[PDB]
# Entry
Amino acid sequence: IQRYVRKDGKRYLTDIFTTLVDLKWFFNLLIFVMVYTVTWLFFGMIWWLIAYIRGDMDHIEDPSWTPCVTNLNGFVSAFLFSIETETTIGYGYRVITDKCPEGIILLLIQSVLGSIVNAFMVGCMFVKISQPKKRAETLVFSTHAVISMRDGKLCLMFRVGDLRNSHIVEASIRAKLIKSKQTSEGEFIPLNQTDINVGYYTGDDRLFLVSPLIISHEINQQSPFWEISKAQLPKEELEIVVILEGMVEATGMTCQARSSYITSEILWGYRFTPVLTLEDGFYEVDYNSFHETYETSTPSLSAKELAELANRAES
Amino acid sequence: IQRYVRKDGKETYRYLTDIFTTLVDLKWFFNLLIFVMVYTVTWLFFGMIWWLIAYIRGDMDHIEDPSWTPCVTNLNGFVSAFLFSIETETTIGYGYRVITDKCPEGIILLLIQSVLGSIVNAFMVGCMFVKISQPKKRAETLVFSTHAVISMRDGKLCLMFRVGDLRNSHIVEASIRAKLIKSKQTSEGEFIPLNQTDINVGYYTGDDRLFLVSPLIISHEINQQSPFWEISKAQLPKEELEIVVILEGMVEATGMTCQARSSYITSEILWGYRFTPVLTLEDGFYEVDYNSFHETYETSTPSLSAKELAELANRAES
Amino acid sequence: IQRYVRKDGKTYRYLTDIFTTLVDLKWFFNLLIFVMVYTVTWLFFGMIWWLIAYIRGDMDHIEDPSWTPCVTNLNGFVSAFLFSIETETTIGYGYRVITDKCPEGIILLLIQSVLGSIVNAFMVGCMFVKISQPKKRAETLVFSTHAVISMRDGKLCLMFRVGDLRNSHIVEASIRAKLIKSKQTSEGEFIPLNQTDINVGYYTGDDRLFLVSPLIISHEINQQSPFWEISKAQLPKEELEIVVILEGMVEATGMTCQARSSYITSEILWGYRFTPVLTLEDGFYEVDYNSFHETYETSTPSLSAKELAELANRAES
Amino acid sequence: IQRYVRKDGKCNVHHGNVRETYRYLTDIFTTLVDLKWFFNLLIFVMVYTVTWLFFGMIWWLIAYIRGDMDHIEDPSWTPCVTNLNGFVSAFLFSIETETTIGYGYRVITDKCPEGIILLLIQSVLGSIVNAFMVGCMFVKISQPKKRAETLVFSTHAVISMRDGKLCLMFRVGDLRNSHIVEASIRAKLIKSKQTSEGEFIPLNQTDINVGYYTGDDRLFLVSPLIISHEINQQSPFWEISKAQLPKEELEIVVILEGMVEATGMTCQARSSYITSEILWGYRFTPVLTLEDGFYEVDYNSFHETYETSTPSLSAKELAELANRAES
# Structure
């Protein structure tokens, strides 16, 4: 029972299909279709216009007259030439002769624009397939947080972990508290955010998801819950926000997950039942008991009152 | 109410419209023009060398006679050379102009031209990819209050400047840092015209990582470590200091990182002013009034510097 | 003697050839799929071109000179497929060309060009993904096969060597270390595995490394570290594990790589010292990776760090 | 004048400079000139020509067995690739078809299935090679932490007095103004030490505080800037005096990371200092001159030029003397 590998922890068709599952499903394809179609229609209209202004269509079959674009004698033919030239095909049944400098300029700008559009399309596809981040990945939190006693200290804790295979075991955890505060100076701030440190000072936040954990926040004189007590917590319109971000093992990706706890989901005097039980030579994880919580004796006084009582006893 | 009780965090047409208008700036047209020019110079150079090979082989008078194979058939030198260059380099080749097997120089020239055109196309693809794939997007939806204020708070004197997003659910995770830029002179005679300093908006406690569910006030406390420790009211207009604020966060829709920036000059920093609440609470739901986002209102605060305020507090204690 | 100079901290063909062989195996079985996709697209679209030619009845006229087929010189299935590969891949020789007298032909040509561009972009993306090989693990950055506890400047410290082998695969790295063991809280709240972070220098920034050569990273056993209470006698008793994670921001070229390893109660040696991998001589140094792991014994108190500190304080009194 | 940067870059004037610098930086970052330029250029030309030559050889052979030559001049014949003289025309057809040009003066006939399958494989292989090259370019341009060229550190590090404290300071800045901003700096020294227990470390690394605690190590770089480290109780230099500095043979490194504002990418730079380059009792000359409505930065004074008068006392003994005077 050792949680390590000297360089690790302790289907090609499916991967290709998943890669092809990139976010660019259907709407982006329609966007490409309309942009290409409007570009081609615009340039075909311009080709028809330049042929018309030249009087080329008036001569039409005249052999003594050299046309701008050979065999271009109609709007449909002009659009066909636009699609052929812009998309770099040029069948040759329609081809521009040297006797039209305006035609040369138009061909130059059309080719440059076509290259621009192709590069833009390639970049869009590249960005669509290259997603810089993901979401969730079943990093489920606890549906309840608890406040309990620990080695002579009162702390708040909420379980974290993954119910799937341990494909993500490195993460960082952040926790914010959102509350309304009335300053002594009379200013009222409806949404006052504070950070309920989960170990930022010590670097402990860089936790290791080997197994579901009980993240603990210590209620010290700095902690926002320093004044809360048993009877006060139901009344308080409190809230918590927990954010967890980590990276996956057998591939390069970063995942994020979040949640909140309001005040109904925060239980006082409750303790998490262990998910891990150890036996000689083996271990078992009772994942179905992940959320399950059981009650235990705890003081009803606030951490501030606990410190005051301890100081009075010491005196 | 119940923010983020949903584990999610609570239109496409608007996003599509914004993307369409995202390239409406003239700078995109300027970039198109400059690459039009680079393509034009490449094509013109290759066209002039095509005309050069045609002239060296001669074959201009022979064009009236089939008794010759003019390298690239049907070539009126000056203009047809450039036209063939555009047809060949860009992979069109209409076939009205085609190179013949009888002139190896033309074959090698076509090979080098194709290679160079592929290189240039690769360069364009890379440039466009870099343009679209900027790691740090300069998002336009992040706004800072045009004024920063100095106010009284819980027995402390603090500086505040409001930050938020306009789309109201677009970027919720962001980290903020602020740097002060000022001239400084030391007792040893050193004069450093641009002396930077960091104002602790929470870096120590990890509080600098914001959750922007709503437009928010960022508060910095003026203590011993704060640069403003000496600043008094009447002194603030004179001091001619400056601030710069940087905010970076990940976009909610996709995990790309976007960044915003702003600054404050001593004229923009007010004394004894408080931000009017953007967000007000109502039964069932809250109402956010962005029109009051920038607005500030005045209130009574001490005119002394934080240092003198602490000194008088200590004197009163004694 | 300096090899840390302004830019470089101090054969492309061979690396290109090795990458060429590795990428050779890949396509040896991959291209296969790419041909599959291209040929399926081309066969389908040649089939539909033949279908439109049939419905229009071009083949019925066939050699009739007065007729104007949708696609000139289409005579059968193979010719239609050939025109499909010509148009889709943007070659278009032109001996078989589309005329203007069939709007359905124009519509299908638009669909063909757009789908060809889309599939080409998807090709480029797939090729990029395959060449990327986003494997985070690093072959080098071997950790010492033992962690050690030793005495330094009146303080006990736990240490474990780390470094690269080529001195080029990594120059910068950040280190983290977590000790995970069961705990029996005084309030009866048993924890099967309780993690803790051992300070390798997060507070002061020392946790960032410059791996010019094999380093020994030392965690000081102060009054706020897990090993503060343990002693030589306890260490065999206290079953515990240590995990070390080292991430190199750049492999001297720009790509981030990550490593990991562990240590166990029997793999931690008390009162031992690391053999110096580097010895200095006039004008040049010598490095011997053969001694990387080698460890030798040294004198040290058997007291706990806590007991040692208490004894020192009592002596000061 | 102020660096308002209200929603964009600094208060400076440039229109075409932006495009020129963008193009130049992208070109150098894609090229990695010295080794990779010619290197990969040749790699490419060759990868192509070998594919073209090989396909040309196979085209010639497929024409040879029955396709042409024997019936080259026969009107009744239908060559696999019309107008194909073996060697030169085979190579020309290969270069035309693989490149997607296809002039059409020489084209593939339908009634020759071998030619059709050959064309299919050739076109797929050409697409594959083009995509592979594009992917290589994409990965080479995308990889972060690209070596910076405009970013430079002062060729000397200096030690001087400041507000009664003794500080080490070394100037940092970017030559191309307003190219890189929001950089982060960290500095390490690499000195051998012997512990009281007899253990000798051939190479012991210590990180010197340049503002990591306060977060001050993140700097804006509006202009050439002086970075300073304070020699306090924790600082490694706390012991050394003026005379000891040349003897100690200590060494320093400086590593800086920043973002290229023109593209949002990240670039890195580094440098070193040695006991011969760490001057004592000197101060950098100003690099920025303030004027009415404008400021001027004469970069020629950036690197060097110094003057100062500072005590020869060690930092620790200087602090002890200050305490004795205070007592």
